[PDB]
Amino acid sequence: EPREEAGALGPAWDESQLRSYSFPTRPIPRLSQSDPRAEELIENEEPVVLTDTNLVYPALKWDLEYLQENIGNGDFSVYSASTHKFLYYDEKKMANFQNFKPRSNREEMKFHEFVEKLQDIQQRGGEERLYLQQTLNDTVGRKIVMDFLGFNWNWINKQQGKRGWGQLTSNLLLIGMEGNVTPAHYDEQQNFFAQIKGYKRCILFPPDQFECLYPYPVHHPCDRQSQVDFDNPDYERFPNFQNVVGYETVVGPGDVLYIPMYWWHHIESLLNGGITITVNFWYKGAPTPEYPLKAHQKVAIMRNIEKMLGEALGNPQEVGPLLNTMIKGRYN
Amino acid sequence: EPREEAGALGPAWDESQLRSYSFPTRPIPRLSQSDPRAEELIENEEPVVLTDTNLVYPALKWDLEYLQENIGNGDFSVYSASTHKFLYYDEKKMANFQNFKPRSNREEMKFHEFVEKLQDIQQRGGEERLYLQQTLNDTVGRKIVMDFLGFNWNWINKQQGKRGWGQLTSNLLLIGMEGNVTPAHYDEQQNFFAQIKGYKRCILFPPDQFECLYPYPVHHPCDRQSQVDFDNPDYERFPNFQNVVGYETVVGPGDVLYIPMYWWHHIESLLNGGITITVNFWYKGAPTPEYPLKAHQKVAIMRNIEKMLGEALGNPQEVGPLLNTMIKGRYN
């Protein structure tokens, strides 16, 4: 049930703002950072929404005006799409799949340019959609630098130390239009996902649901993304999607969602909820040291096999036929 | 067409002595050792029957009486079976497949014991079948040692040198009853197969027919053997067996069949042809050094993947499910 905003400002959002899907879900726990149960969850690589870390406390005031004024003159990657779905793709892998035609294009622009584009669409009632996704770097301005420095490093550093994680590799700034969706995928890093403006519905699936989510081949540009179209699932090609079960939540300003490494996640900015802003914190996982093997370890194994085969055969397109040749009449 | 034996002794064998199968074949070339075409074939890892190497010239006089008298008091492995089919199995791998029940059993005995058993079966009109298969070693007697030393080492050593092969690992003595069959399999060594007494029909398939022959899993005791029952093929489990095409020949005393590493072979002692005797020469292949990859190289790759997965998962029985999980909805 949607939470009530302090001061009797009503419900933060309602059901009608959620897209509808074919699968059930259970709620991710929302807990205080001081609650031992939250620590148990993170330690165990299970998701949890933390309500009071103050992780990005100083960014809570951010909005397009403040960012345009302070974020510098660096370039920003902005994706453009004609659908609500922003399927991630790896440009470096495009050569090996000449027939893949991305539904979204990346354009580099200045922040003011991004803001202007958002304005032109609104005014012209256009259907175009934009999603800015850009790692925070040295070119940001003074005020932003001050804000960044005011993040709760004390808490997040203890988290990094307590779990044996590797280094912070980056913080991605995500600014999206209402209704935008990042389709289901898994990342190979641990993520603290800090919501700043607006509301995002996050649906997660554990690594042991690999069989139900059907990731693209490792050498395909959509490596790590699910092939299933959540809006129109093809149960013929992906029969086990009929067995998928999610853990869901809606995060708002101030909330931090722990998205554990290898966990699938589908993220959507609420319909009619305005622009969203998020900043993530990506950490390399702990080192690989016992049976029985964990689901995520098996996933690590499958990726490696695919990778080795691709190199050994000299053509990634030869990966499938060999695998098929290996199992038919033998293991299936 | 069956050859004519010197001195007008008639046909060496006839069609009625061949078992019947569902697939077609083409003849393997029979050539003189001095013929350049024979050298081209071996160089290219293609089968050839050499008619005049004199490779085991001194063994042409061997028969059960001479061997019983001269082969020593060492132990001999003898397989016993109630079917004509002597499917090879690796005893060391039996623990990992508790449910595999071999159709043949191995018994160690003295040569005279083997000969006696052959006699008791004949006399008692029994249906039992025996196949002796034993590596030649130090315990053989003086006369046999003399015979072995008289093999044409000059020719076979040049062959080993010309092809870059590794060392002679062994020579297997095979003594079989008429009608015995060794079902289709591939060996990881190069083989010069020297026929001594009786006639054997040898049907070979190139390594690129892997998809049609359906070898057992690498960790299964029948690793390297085809799962298809040539006498009653199940086209439902093994549909591509309907596309298999063999290279066949019948070898007799004095002939040497080159069976190239990784080539499938099915070997049968002619029906009503009496006992057969053969001695093989197994050499390690040349070293692994260019695209496009050869069929046998791909086979090498598949074995390795299976092997690595088995070790990595800690249970070979987990190999299939992981592979299946890797391809369904992804590569198939």
């Binding site: 040295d138 280094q167 590799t169 790590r224 990506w282 194994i301 | 990595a312």
Partner: peptide, 22 residues
């Protein structure tokens, strides 16, 4: 085999380096 890389839905100063520099 059990070893893993660090790929995510973003291309490869930032992270730890950004922070320390600041």
């Amino acid at each position: 085999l059990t070893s893993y890389d660090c790929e995510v839905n973003a291309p490869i100063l930032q992270g730890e380096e950004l922070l320390r520099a600041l």
